[PDB]
């Protein structure tokens, strides 16, 4: 899959090449360590690419906003407040075939991140050892791909993304355990984004472009209107934003932030307020 590619603004588990059950873990307000995967937010890392430097910040997703930092001139690493230090940027270069990634410090690119036998991390000069090779796995793909899900608006604990009765229009509705409210989320390799298929009619969540900007169930199409970048909120891994590929500044949104049964779901310009935030759970 291309779902684990090192895209800007995606959130990852970062694992040692020699153990797919371990991940980079923020264990305290300063310390990182390899730990058994628990899929907690302190084990999830957002990539923020800096085009000028051709290097990335690596930000923990537990709400603290701290970033992976080389404690120059020492050999240690930590999570620290972002002060835009050169020591807080990292080249992420990948071997296309092995999929291994070398995490190389921007301030001193002679130094790469290394994991030790005792699960600690440090920077070191480069060898040929797999103790400097990491794998990156996209968290959302690991969790939701090919899964039957429900999508709750953050506006109300009992309002869900639902196909309306006898209509293609998608609206909010309280949970009634209907196939109209169950969505199979499937990653599409060609578009590098997701479709969401309504269980009741096997048709897909699609932006219908006109002045109303409603989402509807629609037949399969190659058009970008049917494809969605599903992401966590910028600094909250418990909630999701769904950006439409036809215009990625526009997102799945609840009309006028209303909560009544029947309220239109639409695609509108991003602001990040609660009417654009969704709670995705596995059925």
UniProtKB/Swiss-Prot annotation:
Pfam families in the cross-refs: RicinB_lectin_2
Compartment(s): Secreted
Domain of life of the native organism: Viruses
Domain Ricin B-type lectin stretches: 9-137, 177-281
Keywords attached to this entry: Hemagglutinin, Lectin, Repeat, Secreted, Virulence
Predominant location: secreted
Sugar-binding site 2, as annotated region: 253-276
2-beta repeats: 191-236
Start and stop residues of the 1-beta repeats: 53-97
GO CC list: extracellular region
Start-end of each 2-gamma repeat: 237-283
InterPro entries tied to this protein: Ricin_B-like_lectins, Ricin_B_lectin
1-gamma repeat spans: 98-145
Gene Ontology molecular function: carbohydrate binding
Name this protein carries in UniProt: Main hemagglutinin component type C
Gene name of the encoded protein: HA-33
């Amino acid at each position: 899959t291309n779902a684990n590619d090192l895209r800007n603004n995606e959130v990852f588990f970062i694992s040692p090449s020699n153990n797919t059950n371990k991940v980079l873990d923020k264990i305290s307000q300063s310390e990182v360590k390899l730990w058994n995967k628990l899929s907690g937010a302190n084990q999830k890392w957002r990539l923020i690419y800096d085009t000028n430097k051709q290097a990335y910040k690596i930000k923990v997703m537990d709400n603290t906003s701290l970033i992976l930092t080389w404690n120059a001139p020492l050999s240690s690493v930590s999570v620290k407040t972002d002060t835009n230090g050169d020591n807080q940027y990292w080249y992420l270069l990948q071997n296309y075939i092995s999929r291994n990634v070398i995490i190389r410090n921007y301030m001193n690119p002679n130094l790469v991140l290394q994991y030790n036998i005792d699960d600690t991390l440090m920077v070191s000069t480069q060898t040929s050892s797999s103790n400097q090779f990491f794998k990156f796995s996209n968290c959302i793909y690991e969790a939701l791909n090919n899964r039957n899900c429900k999508l709750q608006t953050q506006l109300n604990s009992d309002r869900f993304l639902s196909k309306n009765l006898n209509s293609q229009i998608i609206v909010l509705w309280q949970w009634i355990d209907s196939s109209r409210q169950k969505w199979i989320i499937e990653y599409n390799e060609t578009k590098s984004a997701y479709t969401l298929k309504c269980q009741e009619n096997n048709r897909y969540l699609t932006w219908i472009q006109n002045s109303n900007n409603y989402v509807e169930t629609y037949q399969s199409t190659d058009s970008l209107i049917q494809y969605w970048n599903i992401n966590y909120l910028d600094n909250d891994a418990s909630k999701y934003i769904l950006y439409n590929l036809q215009d990625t500044n526009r997102v799945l949104d609840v009309y006028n932030s209303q909560i009544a049964n029947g309220t239109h779901v639409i695609v509108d310009s991003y602001h990040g307020n609660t009417n654009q935030q969704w709670i995705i759970n596995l059925i």
